[PDB]
Write a protein that binds this ligand. Sequence first.
Ligand SMILES: Oc1nc(S)nnc1Cc1ccc2c(c1)OCO2
Length: 133
Amino acid sequence: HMCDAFVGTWKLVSSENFDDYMKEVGVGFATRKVAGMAKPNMIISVNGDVITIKSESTFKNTEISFILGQEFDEVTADDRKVKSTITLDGGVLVHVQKWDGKSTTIKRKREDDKLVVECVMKGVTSTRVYERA
Ligand SMILES: Oc1nc(S)nnc1Cc1ccc2c(c1)OCO2
């Protein structure tokens, strides 16, 4: 019942500062414009110890499966090749991506009927709010 309250199908309903987050990560102009338009659905499921997070949008479809605390390789929607580790910290999924000597952290939490995603690169935060689909 690890992650029960995250499981389901979620749709993006608001975003703030995502362009600035993407700039801080190193995303180029054209990818930022097309990625910033997307309204992804996030689909989260759990089978035993394996958590799967899918993102489906008109920009890119992605899928990661992982065990908490166990590093994995991830190709992000913006085409970075990163090494990722996801843990649970006080009920928050904390996802750290490392590449090219850089690091970004993505936190996913349940707040009321929302799933809130906070993306941080250095001093820049983007907040992306999802509701049940
Ligand atoms: O649109 C998205 N929304 C959520 S919450 N997560 N991933 C995505 C997909 C995505 C697009 C562009 C990006 C990125 C990730 O990282 C830097 O540039």
